Amino acid sequence: KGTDSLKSSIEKYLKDKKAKVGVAVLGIEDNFKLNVNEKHHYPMQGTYKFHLALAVLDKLDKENISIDKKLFVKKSELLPNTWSPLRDKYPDGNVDLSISEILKATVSRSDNNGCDILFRFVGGTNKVHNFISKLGVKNISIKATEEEMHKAWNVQYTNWTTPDATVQLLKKFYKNEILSKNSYDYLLNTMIETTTGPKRLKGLLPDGTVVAHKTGSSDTNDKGITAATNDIGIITLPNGKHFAIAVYVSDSSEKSDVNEKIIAEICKSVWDYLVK
Ligand SMILES: O=C(O)[C@H]1/C(=C/CO)O[C@@H]2CC(=O)N21
Numbered sequence: 001k002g003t004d005s006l007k008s009s010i011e012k013y014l015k016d017k018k019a020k021v022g023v024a025v026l027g028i029e030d031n032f033k034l035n036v037n038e039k040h041h042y043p044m045q046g047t048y049k050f051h052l053a054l055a056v057l058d059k060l061d062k063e064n065i066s067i068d069k070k071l072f073v074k075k076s077e078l079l080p081n082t083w084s085p086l087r088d089k090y091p092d093g094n095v096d097l098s099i100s101e102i103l104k105a106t107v108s109r110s111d112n113n114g115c116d117i118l119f120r121f122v123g124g125t126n127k128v129h130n131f132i133s134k135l136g137v138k139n140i141s142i143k144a145t146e147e148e149m150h151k152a153w154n155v156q157y158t159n160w161t162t163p164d165a166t167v168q169l170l171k172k173f174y175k176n177e178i179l180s181k182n183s184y185d186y187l188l189n190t191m192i193e194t195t196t197g198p199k200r201l202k203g204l205l206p207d208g209t210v211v212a213h214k215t216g217s218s219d220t221n222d223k224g225i226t227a228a229t230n231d232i233g234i235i236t237l238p239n240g241k242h243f244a245i246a247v248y249v250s251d252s253s254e255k256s257d258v259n260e261k262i263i264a265e266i267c268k269s270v271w272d273y274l275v276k
């Protein structure tokens, strides 16, 4: 009967997939809800740079600090051997960068040094955890910086979420219940104006569908397990309405192109349902 047939359709798709896949959908203006494998903790990876950006922009809003205020970034903070367009652009460090530019690198391009710079700015991972909890969203654990996750293999699992929590947080954000209008407009634009994950949530959608999103990805260990392949965001339906969706393909033995196709197929079948 509608939602449960779509849910059964997704579960049948997931049966032969060697991964633990979590799915959540929340209508923005017309309450719609769908969960698959909700009672599970999924490693977030890069998706938690969205949570960090909320915390940075909230701090700017509350303390009346301009997004153009510049922060001095020491060379020792532009770590090597990590994804970081910031360090590529400023290899020698010791540069004054506006918060706006660090945020853009972090959200739109998933900069890891940008991420840790901003964690320092808001007072560390626990401060972001508290900020998120006090918004009334439970079941998000934020324990490790990018530099910390790049050490032991296990550390990435201490940044975890249920799919429900993400989609609740995306909806609060998207309905502008969190930020000032200017902070909201900026974060939203950087989530639309990203080049990442073209084969994930957006993979099978019609050309030009606007999708504000944040990806997350992990390494693959030598037992062929890719810990995390994620995409979360807000999608615009043909009638101009929206839905928040989060897909976490975790602890997967499948090849990377299958992991992305899973996100794209699931999103497509949710799209088809709400369009019909
Ligand atoms: O497009 C719409 O009319 C509504 C809808 C209808 C089907 O549940 O559900 C999704 C949530 C939303 O905004 N959409």
Ligand SMILES: [Cl-]
Pocket: 256
């Ligand atoms: Cl690969």
